[PDB]
Enzyme design. Structure first.
Site, short mmCIF file in Angstrom:
data_model
loop_
_atom_site.label_atom_id
_atom_site.label_comp_id
_atom_site.label_asym_id
_atom_site.label_seq_id
_atom_site.Cartn_x
_atom_site.Cartn_y
_atom_site.Cartn_z
N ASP A 14 0.90 -1.09 0.06
CA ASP A 14 0.01 -0.14 0.05
C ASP A 14 0.74 1.27 0.07
O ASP A 14 1.40 1.77 1.15
CB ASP A 14 -0.71 0.04 1.43
CG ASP A 14 -2.03 1.09 1.16
OD1 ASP A 14 -2.02 1.96 0.43
OD2 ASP A 14 -2.64 1.06 2.24
N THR A 15 1.27 1.65 -1.33
CA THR A 15 1.83 2.99 -1.21
C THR A 15 1.30 4.10 -0.63
O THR A 15 1.97 5.28 -0.45
CB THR A 15 2.35 3.28 -2.90
OG1 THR A 15 1.37 3.33 -3.47
CG2 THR A 15 3.17 2.23 -3.39
N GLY A 16 -0.07 4.03 -0.55
CA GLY A 16 -0.87 5.45 0.10
C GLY A 16 -0.71 5.29 1.51
O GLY A 16 -1.43 6.07 2.15
#
Ligand SMILES: C/C(=C\C(=O)N[C@@H](Cc1ccccc1)[C@H](O)CN(Cc1cccs1)S(=O)(=O)c1cc(F)c(F)cc1F)C(F)(F)F
Lengths: 99, 99
Positions: B25-27
């Protein structure tokens, strides 16, 4: 481009006459943008994450430019605290995770 | 590996000898796992997501092997909709976004 993750992967997006900073977010199925009164048909939706759910408006076939790359697809509009580019559009600009 | 985004980027992780599925999850700034037991001292923390704020338990210097790559860092435990590997550990395993 290659984007490291020392900081939030914020990039400039364009939707009509609005430029916004948005997260390239592999953890998001769908794209969610801050409140904006876009033209055309929409449908109500509830979307959930950490903290619970918010109400959004789903607009389809909206052209969006992400880092100068063309995309077009569904965007969810509502009281999100951050603009989020989800997998529905990340695939369209050729985005992958690599390690 | 190179991971495309037509599907959720779920990978197997190993933590405390247990195998779990977690979302890359880059966010996410932080790594957040669903309710589980971890050993040692923790401290209360609050984090804010799309729907508001939640209480989590913060565990420091926890080893996780993410898709065969070793990390040791902060793991938050609490009511996330799904196990997420956030940027704190994505950076440790050399994960970048590419398009
Ligand atoms: C709180 C954290 C992460 C987090 O919530 N990440 C989301 C993006 C975000 C960051 C900051 C504020 C608000 C949102 C995830 O990367 C994407 N989420 C998905 C999540 C997965 C795991 C937890 S939240 S989502 O809730 O925002 C989401 C839900 C949908 F239903 C949707 F259609 C699109 C979305 F982007 C942190 F890891 F603790 F930092």
């Amino acid at each position: 481009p290659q984007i490291t993750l020392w900081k939030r992967p914020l990039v400039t997006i364009r939707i009509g006459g609005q430029l916004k900073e948005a997260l390239l977010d592999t953890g998001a199925d769908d794209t969610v943008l801050e409140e904006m009164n876009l033209p055309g048909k929409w449908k109500p939706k509830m979307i959930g994450g950490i903290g619970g759910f918010i109400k959004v408006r789903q607009y389809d076939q909206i052209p969006i430019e992400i880092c100068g790359h063309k995309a077009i697809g569904t965007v969810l509009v509502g009281p999100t605290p951050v603009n989020i580019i989800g997998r529905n559009l990340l695939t369209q600009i050729g985005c992958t995770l690599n390690f």
